[PDB]
RNA sequence: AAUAGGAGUAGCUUGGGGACAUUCGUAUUCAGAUGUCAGAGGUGAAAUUCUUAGAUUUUCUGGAGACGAACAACUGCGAAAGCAUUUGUCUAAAAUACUUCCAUUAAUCAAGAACGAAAGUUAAGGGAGUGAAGACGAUCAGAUACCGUCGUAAUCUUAACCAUAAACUAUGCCGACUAGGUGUUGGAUGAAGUGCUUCCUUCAGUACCUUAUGAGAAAUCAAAGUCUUUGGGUUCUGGGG
């Protein structure tokens, strides 16, 4: 675990086979269409995958299509510029900073706010290195509202 | 003494009192040097 | 028939007071301390002194008129200690022995729900 | 601003006058000249206009207050006490 | 429950409804009657509040008292300027009054 | 040696735990460390209990209790015979 | 402006008449106040703290 | 109270060990005891609010409020001795000799 | 080898060969005219596809389904 | 898709986590009464101290600051410092569940920064009780002390600061492998008791007892083990007094 003191191991088990279920014999186009509809509706890729498992009843996209959902969105050119993970982390950090602006005696909120921003810097640096954020890019707390707008 | 400033275990005056006595002495020397210069 | 009064017993290490009142507790009947009925007015007010005071109170209460008492116990100032003072058992035994009719008995010592600091430092009383 | 290392606004008084008093003056003077928030109109335009008197510029209203800032604790405690019953 | 409900509604009216800020536009909307609900701060002036309440009453339309100042109703809408009073003119997916 | 494995107290997973002050003498002692005795006692002696029953209004007797919970510091408890010095092995025995 | 007899205890008040009808003659300098500390049973007198 | 007496009422309750209890400890969860506490207060408030002061005084004697608390709170988590620790008056009408005499007689 | 032990197969998450604890169920409610794929250990709540009434309630640990329906287990 | 890591979703998950608002109880203390009548406080034993202008005691009111017992633990939470009334709000958190997403993002970290008990400093309140300083009575060979009684600074809150403590699980952190049993706290899985309760299996915490042909200078230690049969990774530290 990165910052917590736990080491909890609750996770996705995954079956041995990468083959399609018996139940669904659907064409790749049907699977792309279903994802496209969820994407168009404004759902984000984790939400789409969770929904695809639950609402549509389908085993996950990498097994039934042979290609990752983010990659499919990118191939159609429609993938989001800001990462889903980065978006939620920045949103939590903005929420903490708004709260901290009101309350100056919340030490734990201050401690978490520096911790989360440090985590944002590490994630940002990795995204810059993989060329998913610009070379000139840097995190700032001033512009963070604009980032997630 | 070393880092274990304390540990009164065989035959010596109290560490805390030595520390107080020396702090008081140190202040007096610091005044004397300040007076002189 | 019969009439009830209220016997307050306030027992502390220095003295054990027997103070009988109306059933309301508004109006007194007898104040007798314990130390007044100590012969030399010193020490702690022994079990014997506690007995003599309670006997005097019983004689006076019968002289006044009242035949029965409810007992209200109070131990050593509460916050200082919750211990019953030395004469308390003797005083209760004396009131029962005396011949007065014994109604309800309660501990009504003032009890801190909370807490606050008391005399002597954090090291406590050394003696 | 960045002109002074740590004296700030009492730099106007300069080297003259004892330093601890200049520090005491610094705290009062900082409080005195701040532009406070107006309860009535929602702008940070409330200034002290005379010793006990604080006027908001925007809504043009005079609140009687403390000497060096708008409120003491005492009045607030009294105000709450009156309200509660 | 209530503060969450009004903020969620305010976010939904921002997201998918239509709304309008400030005294004159709100007055125009109430007189027109195309509004459904006015949300007014207690830090809105007494007379201005009273007038808006009469206009609403006259047009048989809703007013909700906001627990929060003129600026706070603005910060909820992510605007630097104080709002003081606003009018919903098209509901979000959640109906603000219902 | 180091005598106490646990510090003489419920030290585990905790930093500060509040001091109480000794019933005997006001000595501060952590609630986790403190020597606690419940002391459910009646005020009555045996002869007194007989006299109170005989004196009593009603046959039914409520038997007035003392409920104390009296807390001792280590120094007091050993002096006043609430504890012993045990023995090196026996210092771990919870009976 | 209220008669002091009708004040709750622990109120903070100012501009007290030195005796009745004398127009706020006590407790009048900057930041000053008096406290009402008690009320008589008969209601004739009231007890204040300067 | 309906006849205009404002009171403060204090109700204790202990956990009960039900059908099986090999585990010696019989504490309840904080979420559960908060839920019990909330439920208890509403039952007390409801029983008090309806009636006049005289009827409430009659309800206290056989502990009817406690009986209703116990019945409801067994569903959340079994409890044991549920009593009223104290009642204090906040705001008591002290006048009306006629009503006092009528209640007395 | 470790394989003949039947007990370890159900002990937390990863085993000798990890395979999902979760499974799929064919669920039907009368008056909906459907029997429909559903996932034990779902997290998003599910309504019937032909009508507004509830299908499954998910909760912490597997799913709780509903008692208003009848459930076949759906298998490879 | 690493029994590495992050992110998500889900559950009327969890808890004295943090902050803000709110609110309750009680004692103590004071004031207003109240009924009494002589001593009461006080300790090794007294004296100092208080009391006929009514003390101490009783009961009622009102005020004020204060605190959160009992429950309550070889108990819970917190990065540590630290955290116990009620209800609400703003916040974070770990485990569980996952045929959900990312696709190596990591580990430990000089420099630098954050939070950091108690006391102290500086400013406002507040100054109940306790009470460094200080004052008396004793005590005693002397006592500037222990003890008794009084008592300013301080304790508390708000606003700054200060940056150390036996700031101790006296054991740097991450990582694997090692041994039983008794327990215990938070979840998930099954069954029998009367939907729920119990018990079984399993995870993440967490202690104890026994055992180490394991270790150690022994105390002891399930880590201080898998280390002359010496090398999983890394920061920091010590070199007789």
Tab-separated table of N, CA, C and O (backbone and C1' of nucleotides) in Angstrom, chain J residues 180-232:
chain	number	residue	atom	x	y	z
J	180	G	P	2.426	-25.309	12.564
J	180	G	O5'	1.625	-24.427	13.572
J	180	G	C5'	0.324	-24.601	14.130
J	180	G	C4'	0.399	-25.216	15.548
J	180	G	C3'	-0.796	-24.909	16.466
J	180	G	O3'	-1.937	-25.750	16.200
J	180	G	C1'	1.217	-24.552	17.627
J	181	G	P	-3.343	-25.098	15.843
J	181	G	O5'	-3.867	-24.639	17.274
J	181	G	C5'	-4.252	-25.640	18.250
J	181	G	C4'	-4.085	-25.144	19.704
J	181	G	C3'	-5.019	-23.998	20.141
J	181	G	O3'	-6.337	-24.497	20.484
J	181	G	C1'	-2.840	-23.461	20.791
J	182	U	P	-7.620	-23.606	20.170
J	182	U	O5'	-7.545	-22.561	21.359
J	182	U	C5'	-7.658	-22.982	22.736
J	182	U	C4'	-7.437	-21.807	23.708
J	182	U	C3'	-8.301	-20.536	23.557
J	182	U	O3'	-9.583	-20.695	24.202
J	182	U	C1'	-6.053	-19.896	23.681
J	183	G	P	-10.949	-20.617	23.403
J	183	G	O5'	-11.301	-19.064	23.444
J	183	G	C5'	-10.784	-18.145	22.455
J	183	G	C4'	-10.114	-16.935	23.121
J	183	G	C3'	-10.700	-15.580	22.720
J	183	G	O3'	-11.900	-15.327	23.484
J	183	G	C1'	-8.348	-15.497	22.616
J	184	U	P	-13.162	-14.751	22.719
J	184	U	O5'	-12.715	-13.336	22.159
J	184	U	C5'	-12.407	-12.275	23.094
J	184	U	C4'	-11.733	-11.088	22.397
J	184	U	C3'	-12.475	-10.472	21.209
J	184	U	O3'	-13.452	-9.516	21.670
J	184	U	C1'	-10.197	-10.843	20.631
J	185	U	P	-14.775	-9.281	20.846
J	185	U	O5'	-14.231	-8.335	19.687
J	185	U	C5'	-14.085	-6.920	19.969
J	185	U	C4'	-13.591	-6.134	18.743
J	185	U	C3'	-14.365	-6.294	17.427
J	185	U	O3'	-15.593	-5.524	17.466
J	185	U	C1'	-12.057	-6.443	17.003
J	186	G	P	-16.736	-5.907	16.424
J	186	G	O5'	-16.167	-5.510	14.989
J	186	G	C5'	-16.128	-4.137	14.537
J	186	G	C4'	-15.501	-4.032	13.129
J	186	G	C3'	-16.157	-4.810	11.971
J	186	G	O3'	-17.377	-4.188	11.492
J	186	G	C1'	-13.866	-5.162	11.866
J	187	G	P	-18.658	-5.133	11.362
J	187	G	O5'	-18.212	-6.154	10.217
J	187	G	C5'	-18.807	-6.245	8.905
J	187	G	C4'	-17.809	-6.337	7.710
J	187	G	C3'	-18.151	-7.506	6.763
J	187	G	O3'	-19.265	-7.194	5.885
J	187	G	C1'	-15.847	-7.556	7.215
J	188	A	P	-20.488	-8.213	5.810
J	188	A	O5'	-19.992	-9.404	4.873
J	188	A	C5'	-19.777	-9.236	3.454
J	188	A	C4'	-18.913	-10.367	2.840
J	188	A	C3'	-19.503	-11.798	2.906
J	188	A	O3'	-20.400	-12.060	1.793
J	188	A	C1'	-17.301	-11.837	3.722
J	189	U	P	-21.615	-13.053	2.058
J	189	U	O5'	-20.973	-14.503	2.142
J	189	U	C5'	-20.276	-15.088	1.020
J	189	U	C4'	-19.620	-16.449	1.356
J	189	U	C3'	-20.534	-17.571	1.904
J	189	U	O3'	-21.157	-18.304	0.818
J	189	U	C1'	-18.655	-17.370	3.309
J	190	G	P	-22.728	-18.443	0.765
J	190	G	O5'	-23.063	-19.363	2.014
J	190	G	C5'	-23.510	-20.740	1.884
J	190	G	C4'	-22.729	-21.801	2.717
J	190	G	C3'	-23.577	-22.415	3.855
J	190	G	O3'	-24.359	-23.548	3.412
J	190	G	C1'	-21.559	-21.644	4.766
J	191	A	P	-25.948	-23.548	3.508
J	191	A	O5'	-26.193	-24.135	4.970
J	191	A	C5'	-25.913	-25.531	5.244
J	191	A	C4'	-25.648	-25.833	6.739
J	191	A	C3'	-26.850	-25.679	7.687
J	191	A	O3'	-27.593	-26.925	7.708
J	191	A	C1'	-25.012	-24.448	8.549
J	192	A	P	-29.125	-26.922	8.094
J	192	A	O5'	-29.112	-26.711	9.665
J	192	A	C5'	-28.624	-27.748	10.550
J	192	A	C4'	-28.547	-27.228	11.992
J	192	A	C3'	-29.880	-26.746	12.596
J	192	A	O3'	-30.703	-27.846	13.033
J	192	A	C1'	-28.228	-25.137	12.982
J	193	G	O5'	-33.120	-25.714	16.155
J	193	G	C5'	-32.099	-25.816	17.157
J	193	G	C4'	-31.662	-24.451	17.707
J	193	G	C3'	-32.795	-23.427	17.892
J	193	G	O3'	-33.524	-23.694	19.119
J	193	G	C1'	-31.038	-22.389	16.763
J	194	U	P	-35.035	-24.162	18.975
J	194	U	O5'	-35.824	-22.790	18.924
J	194	U	C5'	-35.720	-21.816	19.992
J	194	U	C4'	-35.884	-20.368	19.490
J	194	U	C3'	-37.240	-20.035	18.855
J	194	U	O3'	-38.222	-19.731	19.868
J	194	U	C1'	-35.466	-19.236	17.472
J	195	G	O5'	-33.135	-12.875	5.932
J	195	G	C5'	-34.185	-11.911	5.789
J	195	G	C4'	-34.955	-11.667	7.093
J	195	G	C3'	-34.129	-11.630	8.389
J	195	G	O3'	-33.398	-10.388	8.498
J	195	G	C1'	-36.117	-12.839	8.761
J	196	C	P	-31.822	-10.400	8.347
J	196	C	O5'	-31.264	-10.596	9.830
J	196	C	C5'	-31.704	-9.697	10.884
J	196	C	C4'	-32.024	-10.378	12.240
J	196	C	C3'	-30.934	-11.198	12.979
J	196	C	O3'	-30.058	-10.289	13.691
J	196	C	C1'	-32.932	-12.462	12.889
J	197	U	P	-28.499	-10.560	13.881
J	197	U	O5'	-28.360	-11.648	15.027
J	197	U	C5'	-28.828	-11.397	16.378
J	197	U	C4'	-29.043	-12.708	17.167
J	197	U	C3'	-27.851	-13.681	17.201
J	197	U	O3'	-26.858	-13.263	18.164
J	197	U	C1'	-29.786	-14.884	16.658
J	198	U	P	-25.332	-13.205	17.755
J	198	U	O5'	-24.823	-14.692	17.895
J	198	U	C5'	-24.694	-15.399	19.141
J	198	U	C4'	-24.960	-16.913	19.005
J	198	U	C3'	-23.865	-17.735	18.326
J	198	U	O3'	-22.811	-18.039	19.258
J	198	U	C1'	-25.951	-18.326	17.395
J	199	C	P	-21.307	-17.664	18.930
J	199	C	O5'	-20.842	-18.929	18.084
J	199	C	C5'	-20.783	-20.249	18.679
J	199	C	C4'	-20.908	-21.364	17.612
J	199	C	C3'	-19.833	-21.401	16.505
J	199	C	O3'	-18.658	-22.110	16.987
J	199	C	C1'	-21.978	-21.467	15.503
J	200	C	P	-17.245	-21.843	16.312
J	200	C	O5'	-17.371	-22.430	14.845
J	200	C	C5'	-17.385	-23.853	14.586
J	200	C	C4'	-17.531	-24.132	13.077
J	200	C	C3'	-16.458	-23.508	12.172
J	200	C	O3'	-15.223	-24.259	12.266
J	200	C	C1'	-18.565	-23.135	11.221
J	201	U	P	-13.847	-23.475	12.134
J	201	U	O5'	-13.778	-23.084	10.606
J	201	U	C5'	-13.622	-24.073	9.565
J	201	U	C4'	-13.781	-23.431	8.175
J	201	U	C3'	-12.839	-22.242	7.920
J	201	U	O3'	-11.504	-22.699	7.615
J	201	U	C1'	-15.012	-21.667	7.248
J	202	U	P	-10.264	-21.778	8.006
J	202	U	O5'	-10.388	-20.447	7.131
J	202	U	C5'	-10.353	-20.511	5.686
J	202	U	C4'	-10.753	-19.190	4.987
J	202	U	C3'	-9.858	-18.002	5.352
J	202	U	O3'	-8.661	-18.044	4.535
J	202	U	C1'	-12.148	-17.361	5.522
J	203	C	P	-7.407	-17.166	4.936
J	203	C	O5'	-7.606	-15.858	4.049
J	203	C	C5'	-7.046	-14.613	4.549
J	203	C	C4'	-7.923	-13.403	4.215
J	203	C	C3'	-7.584	-12.136	5.005
J	203	C	O3'	-6.464	-11.409	4.476
J	203	C	C1'	-9.881	-12.513	5.156
J	204	A	P	-5.019	-11.515	5.112
J	204	A	O5'	-4.849	-10.060	5.736
J	204	A	C5'	-5.101	-8.840	5.000
J	204	A	C4'	-5.877	-7.809	5.855
J	204	A	C3'	-5.312	-7.468	7.254
J	204	A	O3'	-4.209	-6.537	7.171
J	204	A	C1'	-7.659	-7.758	7.374
J	205	G	P	-2.829	-6.788	7.913
J	205	G	O5'	-2.943	-5.990	9.294
J	205	G	C5'	-3.646	-6.554	10.423
J	205	G	C4'	-4.485	-5.500	11.169
J	205	G	C3'	-4.195	-5.417	12.694
J	205	G	O3'	-3.233	-4.379	13.010
J	205	G	C1'	-6.449	-5.979	12.373
J	206	U	P	-1.862	-4.787	13.705
J	206	U	O5'	-2.274	-5.349	15.135
J	206	U	C5'	-3.048	-4.548	16.055
J	206	U	C4'	-3.688	-5.419	17.147
J	206	U	C3'	-2.800	-6.335	18.006
J	206	U	O3'	-2.089	-5.587	19.015
J	206	U	C1'	-4.818	-7.446	17.393
J	207	A	P	-0.523	-5.632	19.215
J	207	A	O5'	-0.384	-6.175	20.711
J	207	A	C5'	-0.370	-7.596	20.980
J	207	A	C4'	-1.337	-7.962	22.111
J	207	A	C3'	-0.896	-9.169	22.966
J	207	A	O3'	-0.063	-8.751	24.080
J	207	A	C1'	-3.063	-9.554	22.139
J	208	C	P	1.255	-9.578	24.382
J	208	C	O5'	0.705	-10.910	25.037
J	208	C	C5'	0.169	-10.881	26.385
J	208	C	C4'	-0.757	-12.077	26.684
J	208	C	C3'	-0.055	-13.421	26.889
J	208	C	O3'	0.464	-13.535	28.241
J	208	C	C1'	-1.913	-13.695	25.432
J	209	C	P	1.867	-14.254	28.448
J	209	C	O5'	1.516	-15.788	28.276
J	209	C	C5'	0.719	-16.471	29.269
J	209	C	C4'	0.276	-17.874	28.810
J	209	C	C3'	1.400	-18.818	28.330
J	209	C	O3'	2.004	-19.489	29.460
J	209	C	C1'	-0.285	-18.794	26.708
J	210	U	P	3.575	-19.632	29.498
J	210	U	O5'	3.923	-20.828	28.513
J	210	U	C5'	3.500	-22.173	28.858
J	210	U	C4'	3.451	-23.107	27.634
J	210	U	C3'	4.788	-23.344	26.921
J	210	U	O3'	5.578	-24.302	27.664
J	210	U	C1'	3.103	-22.917	25.320
J	211	U	P	7.154	-24.334	27.480
J	211	U	O5'	7.394	-24.604	25.936
J	211	U	C5'	7.361	-25.944	25.391
J	211	U	C4'	7.451	-25.958	23.847
J	211	U	C3'	8.790	-25.514	23.221
J	211	U	O3'	9.759	-26.588	23.205
J	211	U	C1'	7.011	-24.441	22.102
J	212	A	P	11.147	-26.460	23.963
J	212	A	O5'	11.670	-24.980	23.657
J	212	A	C5'	12.775	-24.733	22.758
J	212	A	C4'	12.345	-24.716	21.284
J	212	A	C3'	13.401	-24.252	20.268
J	212	A	O3'	14.452	-25.206	20.008
J	212	A	C1'	11.322	-23.219	19.773
J	213	U	P	14.349	-26.780	19.931
J	213	U	O5'	15.386	-27.199	18.804
J	213	U	C5'	16.728	-26.672	18.797
J	213	U	C4'	17.615	-27.329	17.715
J	213	U	C3'	16.921	-27.663	16.375
J	213	U	O3'	17.775	-27.375	15.231
J	213	U	C1'	17.763	-29.638	17.290
J	214	G	P	17.362	-26.245	14.188
J	214	G	O5'	16.377	-25.302	15.016
J	214	G	C5'	16.889	-24.308	15.928
J	214	G	C4'	16.878	-22.906	15.315
J	214	G	C3'	17.756	-21.909	16.098
J	214	G	O3'	19.146	-21.977	15.681
J	214	G	C1'	15.615	-21.001	15.901
J	215	A	P	20.244	-21.496	16.737
J	215	A	O5'	19.871	-19.982	16.929
J	215	A	C5'	20.100	-18.993	15.908
J	215	A	C4'	19.720	-17.599	16.412
J	215	A	C3'	20.535	-17.134	17.616
J	215	A	O3'	21.794	-16.618	17.142
J	215	A	C1'	18.276	-16.819	18.082
J	216	G	P	23.124	-17.056	17.853
J	216	G	O5'	23.160	-16.218	19.191
J	216	G	C5'	23.330	-14.778	19.103
J	216	G	C4'	22.683	-14.078	20.307
J	216	G	C3'	23.313	-14.387	21.660
J	216	G	O3'	24.578	-13.711	21.776
J	216	G	C1'	20.982	-14.417	21.873
J	217	A	P	25.915	-14.512	22.050
J	217	A	O5'	26.133	-14.117	23.567
J	217	A	C5'	26.864	-14.909	24.521
J	217	A	C4'	26.503	-14.556	25.986
J	217	A	C3'	24.993	-14.590	26.342
J	217	A	O3'	24.649	-15.890	26.883
J	217	A	C1'	25.949	-12.445	26.917
J	218	A	P	23.640	-16.949	26.242
J	218	A	O5'	22.311	-16.871	27.136
J	218	A	C5'	22.275	-17.364	28.494
J	218	A	C4'	21.826	-16.276	29.503
J	218	A	C3'	20.346	-15.866	29.441
J	218	A	O3'	19.522	-16.819	30.166
J	218	A	C1'	21.676	-13.923	29.390
J	219	A	P	17.952	-16.788	29.923
J	219	A	O5'	17.559	-15.304	30.344
J	219	A	C5'	17.284	-14.936	31.719
J	219	A	C4'	16.977	-13.424	31.899
J	219	A	C3'	15.640	-12.952	31.332
J	219	A	O3'	14.584	-13.149	32.307
J	219	A	C1'	17.377	-11.515	30.563
J	220	U	P	13.262	-13.882	31.825
J	220	U	O5'	12.550	-12.747	30.969
J	220	U	C5'	11.979	-13.005	29.667
J	220	U	C4'	12.581	-12.110	28.564
J	220	U	C3'	11.961	-12.422	27.194
J	220	U	O3'	10.717	-11.687	27.059
J	220	U	C1'	14.307	-12.579	27.028
J	221	C	P	9.555	-12.275	26.152
J	221	C	O5'	10.128	-12.185	24.693
J	221	C	C5'	10.322	-10.889	24.079
J	221	C	C4'	11.027	-11.052	22.733
J	221	C	C3'	10.293	-12.013	21.796
J	221	C	O3'	9.163	-11.362	21.170
J	221	C	C1'	12.578	-12.567	21.838
J	222	A	P	7.701	-11.947	21.366
J	222	A	O5'	7.372	-12.431	19.889
J	222	A	C5'	8.014	-13.660	19.469
J	222	A	C4'	8.079	-13.714	17.950
J	222	A	C3'	6.699	-13.636	17.297
J	222	A	O3'	6.734	-12.986	15.993
J	222	A	C1'	7.673	-15.753	16.921
J	223	A	P	6.066	-11.536	15.877
J	223	A	O5'	7.165	-10.512	16.430
J	223	A	C5'	8.293	-10.183	15.577
J	223	A	C4'	9.556	-9.850	16.394
J	223	A	C3'	10.724	-9.393	15.478
J	223	A	O3'	11.623	-8.494	16.163
J	223	A	C1'	11.151	-11.534	16.332
J	224	A	P	12.760	-7.654	15.451
J	224	A	O5'	13.994	-8.047	16.370
J	224	A	C5'	15.378	-8.039	15.959
J	224	A	C4'	16.201	-9.242	16.507
J	224	A	C3'	15.476	-10.609	16.422
J	224	A	O3'	16.332	-11.741	16.085
J	224	A	C1'	15.748	-10.019	18.692
J	225	G	P	17.011	-11.809	14.634
J	225	G	O5'	16.865	-13.326	14.158
J	225	G	C5'	17.087	-14.440	15.052
J	225	G	C4'	16.274	-15.691	14.656
J	225	G	C3'	16.463	-16.225	13.224
J	225	G	O3'	17.648	-17.038	13.171
J	225	G	C1'	14.171	-16.153	13.732
J	226	U	P	18.788	-16.776	12.103
J	226	U	O5'	18.172	-17.268	10.715
J	226	U	C5'	17.850	-18.679	10.587
J	226	U	C4'	17.258	-19.017	9.206
J	226	U	C3'	17.869	-18.250	8.022
J	226	U	O3'	19.080	-18.931	7.619
J	226	U	C1'	15.520	-18.054	7.947
J	227	C	P	20.080	-18.251	6.600
J	227	C	O5'	21.435	-18.034	7.394
J	227	C	C5'	21.575	-17.787	8.801
J	227	C	C4'	22.581	-16.642	9.012
J	227	C	C3'	23.642	-16.783	10.115
J	227	C	O3'	24.772	-17.592	9.691
J	227	C	C1'	22.888	-14.516	9.805
J	228	U	P	25.321	-18.727	10.668
J	228	U	O5'	26.891	-18.782	10.397
J	228	U	C5'	27.727	-17.626	10.615
J	228	U	C4'	28.958	-17.705	9.703
J	228	U	C3'	29.801	-19.010	9.797
J	228	U	O3'	30.262	-19.378	8.477
J	228	U	C1'	31.187	-17.219	10.039
J	229	U	P	30.827	-20.774	8.105
J	229	U	O5'	29.586	-21.549	7.545
J	229	U	C5'	29.314	-21.529	6.128
J	229	U	C4'	27.828	-21.776	5.819
J	229	U	C3'	26.877	-20.621	6.234
J	229	U	O3'	26.012	-20.230	5.147
J	229	U	C1'	26.071	-22.675	7.042
J	230	U	P	26.163	-18.835	4.410
J	230	U	O5'	26.423	-17.756	5.558
J	230	U	C5'	25.299	-17.123	6.222
J	230	U	C4'	25.644	-15.751	6.858
J	230	U	C3'	25.703	-14.586	5.847
J	230	U	O3'	24.988	-13.387	6.276
J	230	U	C1'	27.705	-14.668	7.063
J	231	G	P	23.488	-13.176	5.748
J	231	G	O5'	23.590	-13.367	4.155
J	231	G	C5'	24.564	-12.623	3.390
J	231	G	C4'	23.887	-11.488	2.628
J	231	G	C3'	23.129	-12.033	1.399
J	231	G	O3'	21.908	-11.293	1.096
J	231	G	C1'	24.976	-10.728	0.696
J	232	G	P	20.650	-11.661	2.027
J	232	G	O5'	19.398	-11.043	1.253
J	232	G	C5'	18.975	-11.604	-0.008
J	232	G	C4'	18.006	-10.677	-0.776
J	232	G	C3'	18.188	-9.152	-0.737
J	232	G	O3'	19.192	-8.733	-1.693
J	232	G	C1'	15.956	-9.617	-0.258
